[PDB]
Design a protein around this ligand. Structure first.
Ligand SMILES: [Zn+2]
Ligand SMILES: [Zn+2]
Ligand SMILES: [Zn+2]
Length: 178
């Protein structure tokens, strides 16, 4: 197995996947690495299994259909993995914890949002459809773009949203378009 966490790229107290060479810190994995379970399979492995069991699950889908899906176990897993893919990018640090807003010429958002809040919400089964999770994820970046206006820091929101959107299209097999 790897000697660094797959998400944050640091060494430490790592839990190793039994079916692939990835490793994870306990709370870097989503869901948090399970207490017992030998063997243990990471989220990357669990998602690959879904695909392998239903190869047709990779044919293209419409986003509008994906968003209306209820959060049954497989859709819950897919949202967890998509959230983890965002945390995998180091620029996710900017969006992880609760933000505050005090900048001359801007007003904070009406509904603040952050990655750790989405993480808790998934853990607590607060989303009933995929739409709930995707709306909160996109709100993170939209709030950032609006607040930072013409400061070049706005680009961080664009960058991390692009990771999100690429991974959303991949994980939920969104039909490719120009
Ligand atoms: Zn880590
Ligand atoms: Zn694995
Ligand atoms: Zn099948």
């Amino acid at each position: 197995n790897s000697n660094i966490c797959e998400v944050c790229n640091k060494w430490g107290r790592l839990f190793c996947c039994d079916t692939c060479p990835r490793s994870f810190h306990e709370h870097c994995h989503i869901p948090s690495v399970e207490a017992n379970k030998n063997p243990w399979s990471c989220i990357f492995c669990r998602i690959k299994t879904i695909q392998e069991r239903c190869p047709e699950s990779q044919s293209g889908h419409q986003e509008s259909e994906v968003l209306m899906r209820q959060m049954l176990p497989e859709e819950q897993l897919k949202c967890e993995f998509l959230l983890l893919k965002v945390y995998c990018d180091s620029k996710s640090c900017f969006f992880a914890s609760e933000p505050y807003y005090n900048r001359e010429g801007s007003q904070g958002p009406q509904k603040p949002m952050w990655l750790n809040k989405v993480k808790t919400s998934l853990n607590e089964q607060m989303y009933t459809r995929v739409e709930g999770f995707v709306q909160d994820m996109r709100l993170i970046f939209h709030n950032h773009k609006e607040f930072y206006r013409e400061d070049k820091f706005t680009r961080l929101g664009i960058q991390v949203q692009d990771i999100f959107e690429k991974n959303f299209r991949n994980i939920f097999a969104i039909q490719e378009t120009s």
